[PDB]
Design an enzyme around this catalytic site. Sequence first.
Site, PDB file in Angstrom:
ATOM      1  N   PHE A 171       0.765  -1.235   0.000  1.00 41.18           N
ATOM      2  CA  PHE A 171       0.000   0.000   0.000  1.00 41.18           C
ATOM      3  C   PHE A 171       0.811   1.309   0.000  1.00 41.18           C
ATOM      4  N   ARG A 172       2.137   1.235   0.100  1.00 40.98           N
ATOM      5  CA  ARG A 172       2.929   2.459   0.037  1.00 40.98           C
ATOM      6  C   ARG A 172       2.776   2.993  -1.389  1.00 40.98           C
ATOM      7  N   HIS A 173       2.330   2.127  -2.300  1.00 42.14           N
ATOM      8  CA  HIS A 173       2.112   2.506  -3.694  1.00 42.14           C
ATOM      9  C   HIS A 173       0.734   3.142  -3.753  1.00 42.14           C
ATOM     10  N   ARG A 174       0.734   4.448  -3.974  1.00 41.99           N
ATOM     11  CA  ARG A 174      -0.473   5.257  -3.979  1.00 41.99           C
ATOM     12  C   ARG A 174      -1.228   5.392  -5.285  1.00 41.99           C
ATOM     13  N   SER A 193     -12.588  -5.242   5.610  1.00 38.76           N
ATOM     14  CA  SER A 193     -12.473  -4.429   6.817  1.00 38.76           C
ATOM     15  C   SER A 193     -12.522  -5.256   8.097  1.00 38.76           C
ATOM     16  N   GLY A 194     -11.501  -5.100   8.930  1.00 40.36           N
ATOM     17  CA  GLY A 194     -11.487  -5.821  10.185  1.00 40.36           C
ATOM     18  C   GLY A 194     -12.582  -5.248  11.066  1.00 40.36           C
ATOM     19  N   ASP A 253      -2.856   0.803 -13.338  1.00 41.15           N
ATOM     20  CA  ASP A 253      -2.493   0.879 -14.748  1.00 41.15           C
ATOM     21  C   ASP A 253      -1.101   0.272 -14.991  1.00 41.15           C
ATOM     22  N   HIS A 268       1.667   1.255 -16.606  1.00 41.18           N
ATOM     23  CA  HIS A 268       2.803   2.123 -16.310  1.00 41.18           C
ATOM     24  C   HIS A 268       3.172   2.129 -14.821  1.00 41.18           C
ATOM     25  N   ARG A 280       9.482  -3.801  -6.321  1.00 42.74           N
ATOM     26  CA  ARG A 280       9.229  -4.975  -5.500  1.00 42.74           C
ATOM     27  C   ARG A 280       9.897  -6.258  -5.982  1.00 42.74           C
TER      28      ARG A 280
HETATM   29  C1  LIG Z   1      15.527   1.353  -0.221  1.00 42.85           C
HETATM   30  C2  LIG Z   1      14.155   1.874   0.152  1.00 42.85           C
HETATM   31  C3  LIG Z   1      13.930   2.266   1.467  1.00 42.85           C
HETATM   32  C4  LIG Z   1      12.642   2.768   1.866  1.00 42.85           C
HETATM   33  N1  LIG Z   1      12.435   3.152   3.161  1.00 42.85           N
HETATM   34  C5  LIG Z   1      11.262   3.626   3.576  1.00 42.85           C
HETATM   35  C6  LIG Z   1      11.014   4.061   4.989  1.00 42.85           C
HETATM   36  O1  LIG Z   1      11.888   4.002   5.836  1.00 42.85           O
HETATM   37  N2  LIG Z   1       9.753   4.534   5.296  1.00 42.85           N
HETATM   38  C7  LIG Z   1       8.764   4.610   4.363  1.00 42.85           C
HETATM   39  O2  LIG Z   1       7.672   5.039   4.703  1.00 42.85           O
HETATM   40  N3  LIG Z   1       8.930   4.237   3.081  1.00 42.85           N
HETATM   41  C8  LIG Z   1      10.104   3.751   2.617  1.00 42.85           C
HETATM   42  N4  LIG Z   1      10.281   3.363   1.280  1.00 42.85           N
HETATM   43  C9  LIG Z   1       9.132   3.480   0.337  1.00 42.85           C
HETATM   44  C10 LIG Z   1       9.296   4.609  -0.714  1.00 42.85           C
HETATM   45  O3  LIG Z   1       9.672   5.837  -0.093  1.00 42.85           O
HETATM   46  C11 LIG Z   1       7.984   4.796  -1.501  1.00 42.85           C
HETATM   47  O4  LIG Z   1       6.915   5.079  -0.588  1.00 42.85           O
HETATM   48  C12 LIG Z   1       7.640   3.520  -2.333  1.00 42.85           C
HETATM   49  O5  LIG Z   1       8.808   2.992  -2.986  1.00 42.85           O
HETATM   50  C13 LIG Z   1       6.579   3.847  -3.391  1.00 42.85           C
HETATM   51  O6  LIG Z   1       7.223   4.400  -4.543  1.00 42.85           O
HETATM   52  P1  LIG Z   1       6.243   5.498  -5.224  1.00 42.85           P
HETATM   53  O7  LIG Z   1       5.682   6.410  -4.176  1.00 42.85           O
HETATM   54  O8  LIG Z   1       7.107   6.342  -6.282  1.00 42.85           O
HETATM   55  O9  LIG Z   1       5.064   4.677  -6.031  1.00 42.85           O
HETATM   56  P2  LIG Z   1       3.598   5.413  -6.006  1.00 42.85           P
HETATM   57  O10 LIG Z   1       3.061   5.461  -4.621  1.00 42.85           O
HETATM   58  O11 LIG Z   1       2.597   4.531  -6.916  1.00 42.85           O
HETATM   59  O12 LIG Z   1       3.681   6.911  -6.575  1.00 42.85           O
HETATM   60  C14 LIG Z   1       4.271   6.906  -7.876  1.00 42.85           C
HETATM   61  C15 LIG Z   1       4.650   8.347  -8.230  1.00 42.85           C
HETATM   62  O13 LIG Z   1       3.454   9.140  -8.387  1.00 42.85           O
HETATM   63  C16 LIG Z   1       3.618  10.435  -7.705  1.00 42.85           C
HETATM   64  N5  LIG Z   1       2.694  10.558  -6.536  1.00 42.85           N
HETATM   65  C17 LIG Z   1       1.810   9.610  -6.079  1.00 42.85           C
HETATM   66  N6  LIG Z   1       1.154  10.050  -5.041  1.00 42.85           N
HETATM   67  C18 LIG Z   1       1.560  11.308  -4.752  1.00 42.85           C
HETATM   68  C19 LIG Z   1       1.219  12.287  -3.760  1.00 42.85           C
HETATM   69  N7  LIG Z   1       0.258  12.015  -2.799  1.00 42.85           N
HETATM   70  N8  LIG Z   1       1.852  13.488  -3.777  1.00 42.85           N
HETATM   71  C20 LIG Z   1       2.784  13.774  -4.695  1.00 42.85           C
HETATM   72  N9  LIG Z   1       3.133  12.887  -5.639  1.00 42.85           N
HETATM   73  C21 LIG Z   1       2.558  11.659  -5.708  1.00 42.85           C
HETATM   74  C22 LIG Z   1       5.101  10.482  -7.277  1.00 42.85           C
HETATM   75  O14 LIG Z   1       5.940  11.086  -8.266  1.00 42.85           O
HETATM   76  C23 LIG Z   1       5.458   9.008  -7.111  1.00 42.85           C
HETATM   77  O15 LIG Z   1       6.862   8.746  -7.210  1.00 42.85           O
HETATM   78  C24 LIG Z   1      11.566   2.860   0.877  1.00 42.85           C
HETATM   79  C25 LIG Z   1      11.837   2.444  -0.470  1.00 42.85           C
HETATM   80  C26 LIG Z   1      13.106   1.961  -0.830  1.00 42.85           C
HETATM   81  C27 LIG Z   1      13.338   1.539  -2.274  1.00 42.85           C
HETATM   82  C1  LIG Z   2     -18.399   4.107   5.273  1.00 47.77           C
HETATM   83  C2  LIG Z   2     -17.052   3.749   4.679  1.00 47.77           C
HETATM   84  C3  LIG Z   2     -16.728   2.404   4.530  1.00 47.77           C
HETATM   85  C4  LIG Z   2     -15.462   2.014   3.972  1.00 47.77           C
HETATM   86  N1  LIG Z   2     -15.159   0.694   3.833  1.00 47.77           N
HETATM   87  C5  LIG Z   2     -14.001   0.286   3.320  1.00 47.77           C
HETATM   88  C6  LIG Z   2     -13.641  -1.155   3.155  1.00 47.77           C
HETATM   89  O1  LIG Z   2     -14.404  -2.044   3.492  1.00 47.77           O
HETATM   90  N2  LIG Z   2     -12.411  -1.441   2.602  1.00 47.77           N
HETATM   91  C7  LIG Z   2     -11.545  -0.464   2.218  1.00 47.77           C
HETATM   92  O2  LIG Z   2     -10.468  -0.789   1.730  1.00 47.77           O
HETATM   93  N3  LIG Z   2     -11.815   0.841   2.349  1.00 47.77           N
HETATM   94  C8  LIG Z   2     -12.976   1.285   2.871  1.00 47.77           C
HETATM   95  N4  LIG Z   2     -13.256   2.643   3.007  1.00 47.77           N
HETATM   96  C9  LIG Z   2     -12.238   3.620   2.580  1.00 47.77           C
HETATM   97  C10 LIG Z   2     -12.490   4.188   1.174  1.00 47.77           C
HETATM   98  O3  LIG Z   2     -12.760   3.134   0.248  1.00 47.77           O
HETATM   99  C11 LIG Z   2     -11.255   5.016   0.725  1.00 47.77           C
HETATM  100  O4  LIG Z   2     -10.109   4.169   0.550  1.00 47.77           O
HETATM  101  C12 LIG Z   2     -10.912   6.124   1.758  1.00 47.77           C
HETATM  102  O5  LIG Z   2     -12.113   6.672   2.334  1.00 47.77           O
HETATM  103  C13 LIG Z   2     -10.140   7.241   1.073  1.00 47.77           C
HETATM  104  O6  LIG Z   2     -11.080   8.076   0.397  1.00 47.77           O
HETATM  105  P1  LIG Z   2     -10.329   8.861  -0.773  1.00 47.77           P
HETATM  106  O7  LIG Z   2      -9.673   7.885  -1.685  1.00 47.77           O
HETATM  107  O8  LIG Z   2     -11.428   9.711  -1.570  1.00 47.77           O
HETATM  108  O9  LIG Z   2      -9.249   9.904  -0.097  1.00 47.77           O
HETATM  109  P2  LIG Z   2      -7.819   9.985  -0.906  1.00 47.77           P
HETATM  110  O10 LIG Z   2      -7.138   8.666  -0.889  1.00 47.77           O
HETATM  111  O11 LIG Z   2      -6.882  11.076  -0.159  1.00 47.77           O
HETATM  112  O12 LIG Z   2      -8.044  10.415  -2.428  1.00 47.77           O
HETATM  113  C14 LIG Z   2      -8.865  11.580  -2.467  1.00 47.77           C
HETATM  114  C15 LIG Z   2      -9.414  11.723  -3.886  1.00 47.77           C
HETATM  115  O13 LIG Z   2      -8.316  11.863  -4.825  1.00 47.77           O
HETATM  116  C16 LIG Z   2      -8.487  10.930  -5.937  1.00 47.77           C
HETATM  117  N5  LIG Z   2      -7.452   9.853  -5.882  1.00 47.77           N
HETATM  118  C17 LIG Z   2      -6.449   9.724  -4.950  1.00 47.77           C
HETATM  119  N6  LIG Z   2      -5.719   8.680  -5.198  1.00 47.77           N
HETATM  120  C18 LIG Z   2      -6.185   8.061  -6.301  1.00 47.77           C
HETATM  121  C19 LIG Z   2      -5.805   6.905  -7.038  1.00 47.77           C
HETATM  122  N7  LIG Z   2      -4.718   6.149  -6.631  1.00 47.77           N
HETATM  123  N8  LIG Z   2      -6.528   6.560  -8.141  1.00 47.77           N
HETATM  124  C20 LIG Z   2      -7.585   7.285  -8.545  1.00 47.77           C
HETATM  125  N9  LIG Z   2      -7.974   8.381  -7.878  1.00 47.77           N
HETATM  126  C21 LIG Z   2      -7.312   8.800  -6.764  1.00 47.77           C
HETATM  127  C22 LIG Z   2      -9.940  10.401  -5.792  1.00 47.77           C
HETATM  128  O14 LIG Z   2     -10.895  11.207  -6.487  1.00 47.77           O
HETATM  129  C23 LIG Z   2     -10.190  10.484  -4.295  1.00 47.77           C
HETATM  130  O15 LIG Z   2     -11.573  10.566  -3.959  1.00 47.77           O
HETATM  131  C24 LIG Z   2     -14.515   3.041   3.564  1.00 47.77           C
HETATM  132  C25 LIG Z   2     -14.875   4.420   3.733  1.00 47.77           C
HETATM  133  C26 LIG Z   2     -16.124   4.770   4.280  1.00 47.77           C
HETATM  134  C27 LIG Z   2     -16.464   6.239   4.438  1.00 47.77           C
END
Ligand SMILES: Cc1cc2nc3c(=O)[nH]c(=O)nc-3n(C[C@H](O)[C@H](O)[C@H](O)COP(=O)(O)OP(=O)(O)OC[C@H]3O[C@@H](n4cnc5c(N)ncnc54)[C@H](O)[C@@H]3O)c2cc1C
Ligand SMILES: Cc1cc2nc3c(=O)[nH]c(=O)nc-3n(C[C@H](O)[C@H](O)[C@H](O)COP(=O)(O)OP(=O)(O)OC[C@H]3O[C@@H](n4cnc5c(N)ncnc54)[C@H](O)[C@@H]3O)c2cc1C
Lengths: 242, 239, 242, 240
Positions: free
Chosen positions: B77-80, B88-89, B148, B150, B159
């Site tokens: 999940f560190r991959h956003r 859900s627990g 996706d 990419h 990974r």
């Molecule tokens: C050697 C190593 C050590 C690490 N140590 C740690 C540690 O100590 N603690 C820790 O928490 N993690 C650690 N990580 C995890 C690392 O920092 C990233 O969280 C992880 O590799 C995900 O890569 P990513 O964020 O680029 O992929 P994604 O989450 O899929 O994001 C891909 C790209 O999209 C853009 N992006 C996505 N979301 C956002 C956002 N919200 N705001 C701005 N830009 C965004 C960024 O350009 C990002 O690079 C480590 C990784 C490595 C390889």
């Molecule tokens: C009543 C309730 C029940 C829930 N039950 C569950 C459950 O059973 N299991 C579970 O896993 N989660 C559950 N959730 C969590 C929910 O599915 C979301 O993961 C969480 O609420 C984050 O909302 P968010 O993504 O809009 O906020 P953010 O993650 O901060 O993203 C905010 C907005 O940015 C955009 N965005 C951000 N990241 C991405 C991305 N990677 N791809 C596309 N668009 C993006 C979207 O428009 C999103 O709405 C529940 C939430 C509620 C309120």
Amino acid sequence: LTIPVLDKGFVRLVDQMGDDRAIVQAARVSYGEGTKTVREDAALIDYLMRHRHTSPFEMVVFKFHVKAPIFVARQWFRHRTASVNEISGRYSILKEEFYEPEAFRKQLLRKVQQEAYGAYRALLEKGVAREMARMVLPLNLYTEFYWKQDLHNLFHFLKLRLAPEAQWEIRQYARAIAEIVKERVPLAWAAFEEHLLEGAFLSRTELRALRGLLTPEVYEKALSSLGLGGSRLKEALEKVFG
Amino acid sequence: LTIPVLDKGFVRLVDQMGDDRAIVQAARVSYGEGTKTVREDAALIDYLMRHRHTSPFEMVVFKFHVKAPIFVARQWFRHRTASVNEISGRYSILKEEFYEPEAFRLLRKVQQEAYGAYRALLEKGVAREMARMVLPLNLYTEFYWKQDLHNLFHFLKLRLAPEAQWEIRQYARAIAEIVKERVPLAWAAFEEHLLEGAFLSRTELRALRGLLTPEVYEKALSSLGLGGSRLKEALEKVF
Amino acid sequence: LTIPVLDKGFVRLVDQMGDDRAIVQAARVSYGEGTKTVREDAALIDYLMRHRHTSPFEMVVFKFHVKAPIFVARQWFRHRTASVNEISGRYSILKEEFYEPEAFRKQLLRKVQQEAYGAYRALLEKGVAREMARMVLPLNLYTEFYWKQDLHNLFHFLKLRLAPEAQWEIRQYARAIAEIVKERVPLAWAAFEEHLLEGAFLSRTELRALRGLLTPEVYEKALSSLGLGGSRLKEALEKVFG
Amino acid sequence: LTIPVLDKGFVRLVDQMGDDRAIVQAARVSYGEGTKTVREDAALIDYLMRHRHTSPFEMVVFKFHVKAPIFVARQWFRHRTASVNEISGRYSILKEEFYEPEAFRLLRKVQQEAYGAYRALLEKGVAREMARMVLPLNLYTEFYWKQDLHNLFHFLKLRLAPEAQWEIRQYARAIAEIVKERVPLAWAAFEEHLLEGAFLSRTELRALRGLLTPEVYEKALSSLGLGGSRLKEALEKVFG
Ligand SMILES: Cc1cc2nc3c(=O)[nH]c(=O)nc-3n(C[C@H](O)[C@H](O)[C@H](O)COP(=O)(O)OP(=O)(O)OC[C@H]3O[C@@H](n4cnc5c(N)ncnc54)[C@H](O)[C@@H]3O)c2cc1C
Ligand SMILES: Cc1cc2nc3c(=O)[nH]c(=O)nc-3n(C[C@H](O)[C@H](O)[C@H](O)COP(=O)(O)OP(=O)(O)OC[C@H]3O[C@@H](n4cnc5c(N)ncnc54)[C@H](O)[C@@H]3O)c2cc1C
Ligand SMILES: Cc1cc2nc3c(=O)[nH]c(=O)nc-3n(C[C@H](O)[C@H](O)[C@H](O)COP(=O)(O)OP(=O)(O)OC[C@H]3O[C@@H](n4cnc5c(N)ncnc54)[C@H](O)[C@@H]3O)c2cc1C
Ligand SMILES: Cc1cc2nc3c(=O)[nH]c(=O)nc-3n(C[C@H](O)[C@H](O)[C@H](O)COP(=O)(O)OP(=O)(O)OC[C@H]3O[C@@H](n4cnc5c(N)ncnc54)[C@H](O)[C@@H]3O)c2cc1C
């Protein structure tokens, strides 16, 4: 399907991953089809929309082929949650297609389009690079691109671009898309229509006015009168009082 | 497609949108299929890869159903750039299944006690959301994961690497195998240019510039297969 | 700048970029301070918020140092619009820190913890790798991390996690964050509280109920009473009566 | 603070959250400053940059006020990982300013007619959101651009390149200058491993293998100060 918009634009559904069944399936994290009965799935889908449990809706994706004026494209691109690929005015030569309004709104065009396309052609003939040449062209120039977006974010897009505050041109494009989504994910769309599109957000003072003017019992009867029961009803009340 | 991972987990493909053809199709912004011979398209795919024109690769999407131990999911999940929906627990009750490693790069004791206190708390009627609290980090969990191509490649590159914790790496291996069969032309390009490739620093290139010569490098490159713009590009990276 | 949460957790503001003045400055695209008057800006802010002009709010960023239970962290990270760096259980020795509930909610702990941690130091003692050993620790183990997020998304997070539907543990963390944010960007918070946190979203049938149970003229008086007048009253009224 | 670009544009630093210290501070999840010696923090920043541990780099944020031609802005906006707020042609009246390129790789006439028609449209009571559609892509627009260091780096890597269009390359050069001054350690590492580095495919590392030996390589590497972990890395990419 394809839908014409404006004088020379359009919206075409290129691909689609999942339908109403996909939302329910992901919601149940199923090993299989993850479906049940249609009113049970409609009910679950309705519930997810109501409670902002958005993840399930992101399991459905739409990919479109859109042709539109640059100025419409720019508002469209303000939405970062999508994947887009546009025809680059850097490599390709630009087609002389311009958006000519049915009528201008209150609060010559053909001429400047001509002069400008004239300049563009002239510049090109002198060897000037495309990337630079295309700058003299107006914002009403048409352009094409692929738009890939998940249902959750597409609904967001629709809520904003369908709103009367959005510029008319892009509203029409949102209407086209809405139509395609309505046919493809009718249950999800039903929920979207009922709870968001045709709904409204009320500020704190607005909810406060509802209190004072109405009592729980009264509100409840009025609601059930329209067909709300159980959770929907309880929730609707809990939105104003609880 | 349900490949197993670990003693109780697995990775399964639920759905997919597009294939190599979709990458090409989108790159061309086609009104139709957007294809040509498999030689021109694979060529285009390799090129887009090389030049970071990544949008087209975003036009292809995979959705998996995954079962893995919580501690593995936290890393996942560190991959956003992905959409996920997990069990859900809070709402449901958790099955008694944990990650019992095969070899260690007593565990039974804790799991039992932990799972024991679980039913205990549940039995006494304590809210489920606080009961699972006592469950170990090796407990198994389940979730759907849509992403996706990419960003999936980015996930794979990170990974699959040796630094990545072993378990997550197995899951990446599982995924990698799946992606390869579904998008062959893209997987190859990813295999040649990124996965199996490497990034060189400036002093590493000055070193190369100091040892080899253009002529020398060109011959060893082409003799290996490189020709076309790939050859000119590889030679410019150093000279 | 530190607010304790639970029995061993906390939230502390590490840094902040921009404040109310930043929201208004960005909305204007100034070359200077971009600030007019607390009255005039407070009005622009309230306007942007209720109209969903969210970009200006993204020009304000907060960074926190948080210590909360892993299980709470899992819920927290569901929010993908943030940056985060967490201490790794693959490189460090997680300190025997556990969350012992104030009281158990209805809908031995000491024992499981004790034993679990003992199994952890045991494995470490046996020479087992860190990344693996930590797998026997309970979800209620405390962890730490840095969390950076922009105002717009932060309000989103608060709106969801402040809700009663959200788990109590994280609500508390949300409450702490809400406090800090209320202190630093008072004008944005006031707008937030008014148009989202304490507001609510009503469906089509719901508005159908209100319309009918009430009448324009009446709803107007209650609304005007509490202070509504102008575009808001206009809007508020149109949300129910066309 | 303010760097002019092209004939009428510019790049301005409006605000900044954190510097080299914040990368290291976050990398450490510190209770306080989380910094040490400038030598160790530079080494730690080089390691994170070199092993793609990118989260810490996201803890630094830059906010710019940019004025560029619309067509430049369109390329800029491909980068989604950023927040932007641009002056809207639906609310305000756009100023008559264009990008008159010093040299190309008439334009005045079209621009005048265009602003003329635009002005003649406004006077006829035509709505702003519609009147501005007669204006060209080299019209100057303005916007705020907020991006964290990590993504900003990705941005500079692509817009600084030869491939990137000239005009946006000039904007990247300006931003590069500001970043270099504000996060010197981060920048040095970015210059060394990314900007001036290169990605080699497999057959490229294959050509290098055999065509050299661990010793013939370490020699030149060491003769450049490279040692320790970095030198072990340089060696394994080819052999390892
Ligand atoms: C050697 C190593 C050590 C690490 N140590 C740690 C540690 O100590 N603690 C820790 O928490 N993690 C650690 N990580 C995890 C690392 O920092 C990233 O969280 C992880 O590799 C995900 O890569 P990513 O964020 O680029 O992929 P994604 O989450 O899929 O994001 C891909 C790209 O999209 C853009 N992006 C996505 N979301 C956002 C956002 N919200 N705001 C701005 N830009 C965004 C960024 O350009 C990002 O690079 C480590 C990784 C490595 C390889
Ligand atoms: C009543 C309730 C029940 C829930 N039950 C569950 C459950 O059973 N299991 C579970 O896993 N989660 C559950 N959730 C969590 C929910 O599915 C979301 O993961 C969480 O609420 C984050 O909302 P968010 O993504 O809009 O906020 P953010 O993650 O901060 O993203 C905010 C907005 O940015 C955009 N965005 C951000 N990241 C991405 C991305 N990677 N791809 C596309 N668009 C993006 C979207 O428009 C999103 O709405 C529940 C939430 C509620 C309120
Ligand atoms: C009435 C009105 C007036 C407007 N006026 C202007 C104006 O004058 N100037 C102007 O420039 N724009 C203006 N806009 C556009 C507005 O600021 C947004 O850019 C646009 O509406 C897109 O909304 P969105 O970003 O939430 O949708 P998306 O871009 O699809 O993002 C959806 C959600 O995902 C999350 N997200 C996605 N990407 C990121 C990211 N990179 N960083 C952080 N979070 C992210 C956010 O929570 C976001 O709300 C206006 C909009 C309206 C409705
Ligand atoms: C040589 C070259 C030619 C190009 N040709 C064209 C062309 O013809 N047409 C065209 O339209 N574009 C073209 N581009 C633009 C290119 O495809 C990208 O849109 C642009 O370079 C931005 O890269 P980026 O998306 O990684 O940056 P960002 O937008 O800042 O995204 C950075 C990273 O964050 C993640 N991310 C951010 N947003 C999302 C999201 N919404 N969904 C999933 N992941 C996300 C991804 O991992 C992404 O790589 C070209 C680029 C190059 C270098």
